[PDB]
Swiss-Prot record, chain A:
Origin species: Saccharomyces cerevisiae (strain ATCC 204508 / S288c) (Baker's yeast)
Database matches in InterPro entries: Chromo-like_dom_sf, Chromo/chromo_shadow_dom, MRG, MRG_C_sf, MRG_dom, MSL3_chromo-like
Note: Present with 1890 molecules/cell in log phase SD medium.
Pfam families, A to Z: MRG, MSL3_chromo-like
Every MRG domain range: 49-200
Protein name, UniProt field: Chromatin modification-related protein EAF3
Functional note: Component of the NuA4 histone acetyltransferase complex which is involved in transcriptional activation of selected genes principally by acetylation of nucleosomal histone H4 and H2A. The NuA4 complex is also involved in DNA repair.
PANTHER family: MORTALITY FACTOR 4-LIKE PROTEIN, MSL COMPLEX SUBUNIT 3
Disulfide partners: none
Family assignment from sequence similarity: Belongs to the MRG family.
Domain of life of the source: Eukaryota
Compartment annotation: Nucleus
PROSITE patterns in alphabetical order: MRG
Subunit structure: Component of the NuA4 histone acetyltransferase complex composed of at least ACT1, ARP4, YAF9, VID21, SWC4, EAF3, EAF5, EAF6, EAF7, EPL1, ESA1, TRA1 and YNG2.
Swiss-Prot record, chain B:
Annotated crosslink Glycyl lysine isopeptide (Lys-Gly) (interchain with G-Cter in UFM1) location: K10
Keyword Ubl conjugation: yes
Self-association and partners: The nucleosome is a histone octamer containing two molecules each of H2A, H2B, H3 and H4 assembled in one H3-H4 heterotetramer and two H2A-H2B heterodimers. The octamer wraps approximately 147 bp of DNA.
Sites bearing Phosphotyrosine, chain numbering: Y30, Y67
Included range, full protein: 23 to 101 of 103
Residues with N6-butyryllysine modification: K10, K23, K56, K58, K70
GO molecular-function term, one example from the UniProt record: protein heterodimerization activity
Function: Core component of nucleosome. Nucleosomes wrap and compact DNA into chromatin, limiting DNA accessibility to the cellular machineries which require DNA as a template. Histones thereby play a central role in transcription regulation, DNA repair, DNA replication and chromosomal stability. DNA accessibility is regulated via a complex set of post-translational modifications of histones, also called histone code, and nucleosome remodeling.
Any one Gene Ontology BP term: nucleosome assembly
GO CC annotations, alphabetized: nucleosome; nucleus
N6-glutaryllysine carried by residues: K10, K38, K56, K58, K70
The protein's name in its UniProt record: Histone H4
DNA sequence: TGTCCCCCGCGTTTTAACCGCCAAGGGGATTACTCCCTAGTCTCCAGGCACGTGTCAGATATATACATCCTGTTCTAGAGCGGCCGCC
DNA sequence: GGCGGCCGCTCTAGAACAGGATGTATATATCTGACACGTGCCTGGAGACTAGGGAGTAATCCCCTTGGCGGTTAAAACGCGGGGGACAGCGCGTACGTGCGTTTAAGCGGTGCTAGAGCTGTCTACGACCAATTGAGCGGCCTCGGCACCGGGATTCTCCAGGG
């Protein structure tokens, strides 16, 4: 189909056109069109968005509170996001999600875990919290093991993380209905945490 | 039998001109050459038809064609 | 009735023409194909008399005579072309050659 | 001298050509029986040819007269120049 | 107060048009020279006859061209790139159109003479024709070898790119 479809420089392909039969080659390498290499280099140089107002008091309460206490005083924190992320597949996915595939919850949970795996160092880092992360990386470098933040970080910063993702969501070229779905599951998250006030 | 004047193809006339030592061959020479060949055939074949009708024969021999070429000063040898 | 309807060789013109002139001038075989000329002969003959046949040798003699006559006419046409300070032949040169020949 | 469009050299895909092969059935080629008109005379006579001659259309002759071609004069259209007018 | 734009004025030239020029188109006057009619033949075709032979026609036969296929690779045909050449155009020029001066031979008319083509005999070898014969030309068969075909290799002339 069409009139111009060639992996090499196009010669109105619909094999090297305009040449004899003793020049064919069908080996496999990388392919680039480049418009016949800029038309043989111009013929050899001419022949040479915000969260809804439902439970917004939490970040107001925690903005003043992290100035001197930072919401945590024990480095091996007993609160981990692993169980509260695992409970989503057993509590809200079996009740609120429409019958079908739970990919929109499980895949998003795995993506949130992957984002939390490397989100440290660039964002969500108060100054003394940065010092605490520095001392955690110092004490975790004595056995040349990777720093895994699933066992030393609480779930209290997850609310701030879903507060600070939407303005960097629109920082890249992205379709609007993906952001609509993002804010939809953010609304689902705040619906789930509306009555579960003990863990946060 | 129709459109038999196009049986003498364009590269056939080109090769005939190449035998005559013609350097360049125009695109309008083919119709004129076909017309000249048609006139020459309409003379020679008609003369051979008269020769065959004279001899009470139904098919025309090569000898009658030789006679028809000879009577117009274009005698042919080998037949 | 019931129907609704890298660099190529790139030979310049003239050299290959002279090559073909040298190849066919020293050649012997017939340039015109057999059956198209035979069919043209039958089509011309059917206007004068129907139910007429031509033998193979009569068609051969007609083809060789026509080839020789057209070769001589093309030689005269090319001679008139060089005579007219040209290398390309024109149909008016063919008409002039026919007028000079008296046919 | 230019130019551009007309033709040539070559890639590609159809396209019919030539040999391979098979019968056919009008048709060239050969042989014979017969029959008309052409080879060859006899005679003549009416159409064809040599000679004589009145004659009727062609050529010479010349003023008159065509007849178109060459050239001079004028008509009208086109470009250049200069005077007048409005604007910044 | 200076300058661009606009319109009128004069200069210049293409071209339609009318008048002069010279070689033919005609209108008689008259010569004139073959044109065709008449006459007198007379020489070739037609009526009629004899005889025969080559084609008209019938039959056979065997032969050879037309139709009619697949196959397959040579090539016609379509189209792209492009490339050199036909022709419009412009300029240089010379050499051929036009015109009479002057010479010079073409032709009309005349005279003499023989070079020789018809014309008429004459006599003589010569070729068609008839017996009689006969010997290699040609259809056909056996043999055989020269170049078409198929590749292999190669000099060899031709185009593209680099250097001065």
């Amino acid at each position: 189909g069409g009139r111009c479809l060639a992996f090499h420089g196009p010669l109105m392909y619909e094999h090297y056109q305009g040449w004899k039969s003793s020049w064919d080659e069908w080996v496999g390498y990388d392919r680039i069109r480049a418009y016949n290499e800029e038309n043989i280099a111009m013929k050899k140089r001419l022949a040479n968005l915000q969260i809804p107002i439902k439970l917004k008091s939490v970040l107001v309460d925690d903005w003043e509170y992290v100035t001197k206490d930072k919401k945590i005083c024990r480095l091996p924190a007993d609160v981990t996001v692993e169980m509260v992320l695992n409970k989503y597949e057993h509590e809200v996915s079996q009740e609120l999600e429409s019958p079908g595939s739970q990919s929109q919850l499980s895949e998003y949970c795995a993506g949130l875990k992957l984002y939390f795996d490397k989100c440290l160092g660039n964002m969500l880092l108060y100054r003394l919290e940065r010092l605490q992360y520095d001392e955690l990386l110092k004490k975790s470098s004595k056995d040349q093991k990777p720093l895994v933040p699933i066992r030393i970080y609480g779930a209290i910063h997850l609310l701030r993380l879903i507060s600070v993702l939407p303005e960097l969501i629109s920082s890249t070229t992205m379709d609007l209905q993906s952001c609509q779905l993002l804010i939809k599951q953010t609304e689902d998250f705040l619906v789930w945490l509306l009555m579960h006030v003990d863990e946060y | 039998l129709r459109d038999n004047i196009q049986g003498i193809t364009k590269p056939a006339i080109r090769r005939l001109a190449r035998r005559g030592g013609v350097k360049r061959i125009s695109g309008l020479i083919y119709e004129e050459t076909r017309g000249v060949l048609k006139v020459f055939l309409e003379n020679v074949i008609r003369d051979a038809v008269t020769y065959t009708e004279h001899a009470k024969r139904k098919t025309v021999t090569a000898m009658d064609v030789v006679y028809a070429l000879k009577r117009q000063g274009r005698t042919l040898y080998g037949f | 009735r019931q129907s609704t309807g890298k660099k190529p060789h790139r030979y310049r013109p003239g050299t290959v023409a002279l090559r073909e002139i040298r190849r066919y001038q020293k050649s012997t075989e017939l340039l015109i194909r057999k059956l198209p000329f035979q069919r043209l002969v039958r089509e011309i003959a059917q206007d004068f008399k129907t139910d007429l046949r031509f033998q193979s040798s009569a068609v051969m003699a007609l083809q060789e005579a026509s080839e020789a006559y057209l070769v001589a006419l093309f030689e005269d046409t090319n001679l008139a072309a060089i005579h007219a300070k040209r290398v390309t032949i024109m149909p008016k040169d063919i008409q002039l050659a026919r007028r000079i020949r008296g046919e």
